[PDB]
Design a protein around this motif. Structure first.
Motif, PDB file in Angstrom:
ATOM      1  N   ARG B 130       0.824  -1.201   0.000  1.00  0.00           N
ATOM      2  CA  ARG B 130       0.000   0.000   0.000  1.00  0.00           C
ATOM      3  C   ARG B 130       0.866   1.262   0.000  1.00  0.00           C
ATOM      4  O   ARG B 130       0.363   2.328  -0.382  1.00  0.00           O
TER       5      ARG B 130
ATOM      6  N   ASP C 123     -10.229  -7.474   4.354  1.00  0.00           N
ATOM      7  CA  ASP C 123      -9.088  -8.269   3.888  1.00  0.00           C
ATOM      8  C   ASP C 123      -8.353  -8.898   5.078  1.00  0.00           C
ATOM      9  O   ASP C 123      -8.024 -10.072   5.027  1.00  0.00           O
ATOM     10  N   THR C 124      -8.104  -8.112   6.145  1.00  0.00           N
ATOM     11  CA  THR C 124      -7.408  -8.612   7.326  1.00  0.00           C
ATOM     12  C   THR C 124      -8.242  -9.708   8.010  1.00  0.00           C
ATOM     13  O   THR C 124      -7.712 -10.728   8.415  1.00  0.00           O
ATOM     14  N   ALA C 127      -7.896 -12.938   6.170  1.00  0.00           N
ATOM     15  CA  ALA C 127      -6.566 -13.553   6.319  1.00  0.00           C
ATOM     16  C   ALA C 127      -6.467 -14.280   7.653  1.00  0.00           C
ATOM     17  O   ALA C 127      -5.923 -15.371   7.722  1.00  0.00           O
ATOM     18  N   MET C 128      -7.014 -13.665   8.714  1.00  0.00           N
ATOM     19  CA  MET C 128      -7.145 -14.339   9.996  1.00  0.00           C
ATOM     20  C   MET C 128      -7.946 -15.627   9.773  1.00  0.00           C
ATOM     21  O   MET C 128      -8.966 -15.629   9.093  1.00  0.00           O
TER      22      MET C 128
ATOM     23  N   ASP D 123       0.028 -13.884   6.556  1.00  0.00           N
ATOM     24  CA  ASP D 123      -1.159 -13.591   5.758  1.00  0.00           C
ATOM     25  C   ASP D 123      -1.822 -12.335   6.291  1.00  0.00           C
ATOM     26  O   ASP D 123      -2.099 -11.410   5.548  1.00  0.00           O
ATOM     27  N   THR D 124      -2.076 -12.321   7.596  1.00  0.00           N
ATOM     28  CA  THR D 124      -2.725 -11.215   8.243  1.00  0.00           C
ATOM     29  C   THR D 124      -1.911  -9.935   8.068  1.00  0.00           C
ATOM     30  O   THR D 124      -2.492  -8.888   7.761  1.00  0.00           O
ATOM     31  N   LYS D 126       0.144  -9.209   5.734  1.00  0.00           N
ATOM     32  CA  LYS D 126       0.164  -8.786   4.342  1.00  0.00           C
ATOM     33  C   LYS D 126      -1.161  -8.111   3.967  1.00  0.00           C
ATOM     34  O   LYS D 126      -1.211  -7.239   3.116  1.00  0.00           O
ATOM     35  N   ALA D 127      -2.253  -8.516   4.589  1.00  0.00           N
ATOM     36  CA  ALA D 127      -3.566  -7.974   4.261  1.00  0.00           C
ATOM     37  C   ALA D 127      -3.754  -6.624   4.964  1.00  0.00           C
ATOM     38  O   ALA D 127      -4.460  -5.753   4.479  1.00  0.00           O
ATOM     39  N   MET D 128      -3.093  -6.426   6.110  1.00  0.00           N
ATOM     40  CA  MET D 128      -2.942  -5.091   6.664  1.00  0.00           C
ATOM     41  C   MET D 128      -2.079  -4.278   5.697  1.00  0.00           C
ATOM     42  O   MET D 128      -0.998  -4.704   5.277  1.00  0.00           O
ATOM     43  N   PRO D 129      -2.496  -3.052   5.338  1.00  0.00           N
ATOM     44  CA  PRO D 129      -1.675  -2.213   4.444  1.00  0.00           C
ATOM     45  C   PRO D 129      -0.225  -2.098   4.917  1.00  0.00           C
ATOM     46  O   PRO D 129       0.042  -1.957   6.116  1.00  0.00           O
ATOM     47  N   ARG D 130       0.703  -2.145   3.957  1.00  0.00           N
ATOM     48  CA  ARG D 130       2.120  -2.186   4.247  1.00  0.00           C
ATOM     49  C   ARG D 130       2.563  -0.875   4.882  1.00  0.00           C
ATOM     50  O   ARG D 130       3.650  -0.807   5.458  1.00  0.00           O
TER      51      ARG D 130
END
Lengths: 434, 435, 434, 434
Positions: B130, C123-124, C127-128, D123-124, D126-130
């Protein structure tokens, strides 16, 4: 690094020559533009400068002054193998000097440290539909890695210095070049080999590691080393090299520049010939020649009939080449040594004898001779790289050697934004007197 | 009438002229090339042909023969709004004709059925970190949609025909143009507005629907219409447009070509001047002019200080322009009308007066005059688009109008692969006569 | 008028009070600490200050001076529903004023534009692992959204200011409170309703839209409205409210603070008594009473046998309450009106008669009376919220009304970092004489 | 040899001590509470019990009775390295004993087994914005793993026994402690080092494997080992440890509890001073001392001008320390040995001479001496950990050693839910007599 220090020497030596050309000789005329050329894609206009390679229309390509046979003989070999470290070719393109063994090994060690692919590149490639063309994936992979750009961080931090700008460009070039064969292999495995992957082997050289990750045994390591060097550069006016140069000229970093370049190389008039020759040969052995190696005679009349139809012989002709491509000649020697009894090769070879006489006489083509694209495919096919679309990615990996070296020097020498002038059709009619 | 039929008509009229130029007047000389030009990025070399727009050094950009005042005057207006249908300028760039109301509404309706983004585009953008630059995301969005290319499908199925190749290129150009505002808005929302998204509204024109998806009230709909039209083309030789042209010349489809273009537009020497001007002006109002609109006098001297202290006035000067950019003028007209009191604009307004005399007196910068970038930011900032890096994406949406129209025409006229010749330093020295 | 300017005025009035207490009465003693209390979780120690609400041992909770009956009487109702706008109770907790109909409509409008869930939150959550407990998903959703914190950006940009800090906090509280029901509903749908989602209706109030998105028809809208109001706050000393205060006292934003609070609320001694009561009643009905309403006398003996065999009656007793919970009474008034013939409610109702006499007789339980958790489950079950683990998430949504109001005031009044002193067992043994 | 058996012995001989204090001495007074304290974040109130460590205002911190020179001296050292096994320190915090070699090795083996990061944690994250802050990521990672909680599963399956409950809590503490450095490293790689990862080396200890996965060479392995021990605990009254204790008190498992803790540690008033010191020093060097290591007198007058202008010297006060932090002193010893000539350290070193005299001269600060945060940054920076926001994650790794050992003991001794009483401002005003 020894490489970076060597390059800084060459830059300091070269810069006064460029400064002098602009200071004393800026106004010396070197070419003209006609209407023909303006409409026809700048054909022939001498309007670009590079020292990485020069494409003689007769003798073919020289890399930093050297012929292909000279390069292949002088560059240190990978211990065990027939062919040079690709790293050593990179050294040559960047500096102008043939590296010693010690010098190549230093570059090899540094590529090993820079070789790992960001996990997010894999994530991005999995999010793109699996049915996407691999050149689209390959260009996307490069582009996504723009996030890591050291040139871009340097500019955005306000640290831009025209004397110094090459330095973060070099680092980006090293980073990108080290990773391009892993990116390519990842795409190959993910699309075509059941999405099972072979880990990078941290003791192999670039080419050897590429063969490893693709999953193809010896001597594919040498196939790739040879292939990458021969495709390394073809001066700067070809579409891919030029695209990179153009985009880079706006001080876009090398990820933006080389992604863009691959959008051009994916173009059917630039990247697709290899596989279109292989197909037409295969389709020729299938239908015309009864499924076997024909005779020189039978072939002879197939070509003659093909040409009178209105059809063309693929992988023959070029927009600048006028004699036999010396990249073709090296592919030929590898084949002759390693797969002489391959039916497809045999047809390739016999095409070599037959096709040139028949159309230097017809005299219709300007380059009645083979380009490298006439020989590459049969070698790939032989070793089981059967996935035609992928062949362009191999080209993409190879051509980064020259192109990224070119971007470092563009920046070293402070070459300006490329921005020619447009004219309208009405303006052309004015000049022509209508 | 139907856009595609109208275009076929124009193609059939135009093609004989190009043919005659090559057949009877091929070898007429139009320019020369010097050492300085080969080294200096082809500067001034007349080696590109387009009919979309033409950049006059003295008069500025003309779109299809028309000046910007004429364009904004003649193009049909969105009911209830100040500015024209962005769709009608596309019609103009494609055909050479000013659309009637029928004709513009046909484009508007055709874009509405092509607006929706492939879902894998959103998937791809989420997989990219992002913290990726907005322009990198914008180029990648475009590039992933090369999966949909009709031109690529046409070619790869064996149907390439020289006369009809323009048709799939048109369809792709229409597919892409329709989507670019939604792709940009997606990127703006995902990065900068907490990743909530306002659906496309199919009762809105392109520009209205852009402001809607971005989440910005009137008159941002007009801000956008005007911005996109102003930024639509600058002939073929600017880096972004040239890159599209170069790439497509190898018969790469528009997604490949326009992704490559945005790689070029992302460059600091091409796509950043808007936000650099704005940052400079803000940094000046703060640390130099006591957080306040200065006097004509103080600014006069501040500028003189900056120049003599070894620096440049951003958004002034150009490689080709030699007088005031009329794109700047159209922005100024909008600002005078809609934000006369805005303190940043006041400095922009004041700079217009003060700077050209000073720069000219110095005789250093060949264009002692402003370009659009001098003006675009104070307008964006005013309406709350504070996210500087995204300005280049606004640029990319707009510039697709002309570039994609140009690629259709490149294919219509069968323009050849662009392949100039490189030379070495040694060769230049030989020709320079120094052995 | 507008909430923020009303809040601003209130803050201007309250500050000098706080400032005077400290400048002039700083050393006035208000309590002691014993060994019992240091070991026993600070029990009874008067060491927290808040004005949002105050828990009276005998009379129960008051919100901004009002009893529950007063709150439910005076707050404007949703046109055509039984219960108040949850938005109106929020106004009350933030300001101390009962809002007019006009003022609540302004908070409801603002909540409609703040309601949308960031797409990366879902999305988070995907993933969880889907087998993650819903309160873990809830705390994670809140925590992911700290990326959007205006207070954090305010701090990071160097703009922290004792006077204005409450303003970013307010903005964050408005953003978070607006979204929490939506986050809750998304979790409910993704885990327990086959992962199909019902979109937000932008014409509904917080309470009505929560029921809409959950997929539950009227009157579950009023069930919710009342539930959230009753759970809105319980002074600042309960674990979840105290966690948020403690965390924010270090100038962590509301997302960090409320996420941590949900980590506390998830605990068996804080968040589970609703479901534990309902499971106990349902086991009691099935096994011990042959799946049928008992008689007042049948249940009186069951209770006595349960108590005298070393078990507790769940949902009776509290750490602070010493009389009947008015939040229990409010649930009962709702159940009497809406589901009087509900068997599970019939046991709840009889337990209210039978249990307190027996608990007071044995004289062991300091609060021989129900708390709210004795009643909440039978209402939720009645309307088909059977997913026990989820009930805590309902508690979390509601408790945010008072906790986020409290954080706004914590920063308004510049309450210092909370940092009590620890001692060792050795030191307690020294205090005691060994 | 088993830690768990040794810990059961220690719990069996501690429990009667606690029992007796409650039975016989429950009513002994240990402190008071004033208006100033209740308003001012429980400042100084002795209302918490822990035995893991104790913060003497004059001595600074003692771990299990021992000083920092003593811990560093007596804990068994990792072979080949300068610093103790971090695992040995955890053994001390848990048991109160300094481990033999056999004992520490056992613990090192157990962490090697428990060290692997769940894939869904990646996974979690990565789904959280970087672009989310690393501490938000750190807290989410911990939170997502409450899925694995042994303590939670033991509760949920009805096995809870107040004598036995420390046992699954220990298991969760070992699991989580073993994994936190791999979570931290993953976050560091994925945000700051181009998202390439260095696999865990199963032959390394906790500190060595951290430095490995971070991609930092020796001696950063010792830097980390020392950093983690130094940050291991600061009794239970600091925001992060207190938050964990509070949440855990409601029988929330360690994952909920340590997640909530890192929400508090993220706060500018608790987790940032390392960053904030290092930046201030850097900025000073650049802006104020013309980019050079200054003279003792140049800096003295700089301090004097900063202090008289009303701006503060970061890293030189504390709410509890009244003398020099021995944590600071161990950092100084390491730097003295390992980076004498580092310009940032030189300035740190000179500040230690200059600032305290000046600070006590005006006598306004209660603690005119450095805390650890004045020293940690120049060391991380020396070794190339330049990413300021990440320093708090290092803190979080470190502090878990003390906090989790504390949660095990909290449950062993069956310490009650923390739930003090709130009062209102009106109530403070009555007591004051207004």
């Amino acid at each position: 690094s020894f490489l970076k220090e060597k390059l800084a020497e060459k830059i300091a030596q070269h810069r006064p020559r460029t400064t002098r050309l602009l200071s004393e000789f800026g106004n010396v005329k070197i070419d003209e533009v006609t209407i023909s050329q303006a409409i026809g894609g700048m054909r022939g206009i001498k309007s670009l400068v590079t020292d990485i390679s020069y494409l003689d229309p007769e003798e073919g390509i020289r890399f930093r002054g050297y012929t292909i046979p000279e390069v292949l003989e002088k560059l240190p070999k990978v211990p065990g193998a027939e062919m040079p470290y690709v790293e050593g070719h990179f050294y040559l393109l960047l500096t102008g000097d043939v590296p010693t063994e010690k010098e190549v090994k230093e570059v090899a060690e540094e590529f090993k440290k820079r070789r790992a692919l960001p996990e997010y590149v894999k994530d991005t490639l999995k999010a793109m539909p699996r049915d996407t063309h691999p050149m689209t994936m390959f260009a996307a992979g490069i582009l996504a890695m723009q996030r890591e750009s050291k040139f871009a961080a340097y500019y955005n931090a306000g640290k831009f210095n025209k004397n110094t700008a090459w330095e973060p460009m070099f680092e980006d070039a090293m980073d990108l070049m080290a990773r391009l064969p892993s990116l390519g292999a990842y795409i190959y495995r993910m699309k075509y080999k059941s999405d099972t992957h072979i880990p990078s082997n941290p003791d192999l050289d670039l080419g050897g590691d590429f063969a490893n990750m693709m999953g193809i045994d010896k001597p594919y390591d040498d196939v790739a080393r040879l292939y990458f060097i021969l495709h390394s550069d073809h001066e700067s006016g070809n579409v891919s090299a030029h695209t990179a140069h153009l985009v880079a000229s706006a001080l876009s970093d090398a990820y933006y520049a080389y992604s863009a370049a691959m959008c051009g190389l994916a173009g059917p008039l630039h990247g697709l010939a290899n596989q279109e020759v292989l197909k037409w040969i295969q389709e020729t052995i299938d239908k015309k020649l009864g499924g076997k190696v024909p005779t020189k005679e039978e072939l002879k009349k197939f070509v003659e009939e093909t040409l009178s139809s209105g059809q063309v012989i693929p992988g023959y002709g070029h927009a600048v080449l006028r004699k036999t491509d010396p990249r073709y000649v090296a592919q030929r020697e590898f084949a002759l040594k390693h797969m002489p009894d391959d039916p497809i090769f045999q047809v390739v070879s016999m095409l070599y004898e037959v096709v040139p006489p028949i159309l230097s006489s017809l005299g219709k083509v300007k380059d009645p001779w083979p380009n490298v694209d006439a020989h590459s495919g049969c070698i790939q096919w032989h070793y089981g790289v059967v996935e035609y679309d992928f062949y362009t990615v191999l080209f993409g990996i190879g051509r980064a050697l020259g192109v990224l070296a070119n971007l470092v020097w563009d920046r070293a020498l402070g070459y300006a934004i490329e921005r020619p002038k447009s004219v309208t059709t009405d303006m052309l009619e004015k000049w022509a007197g209508i």
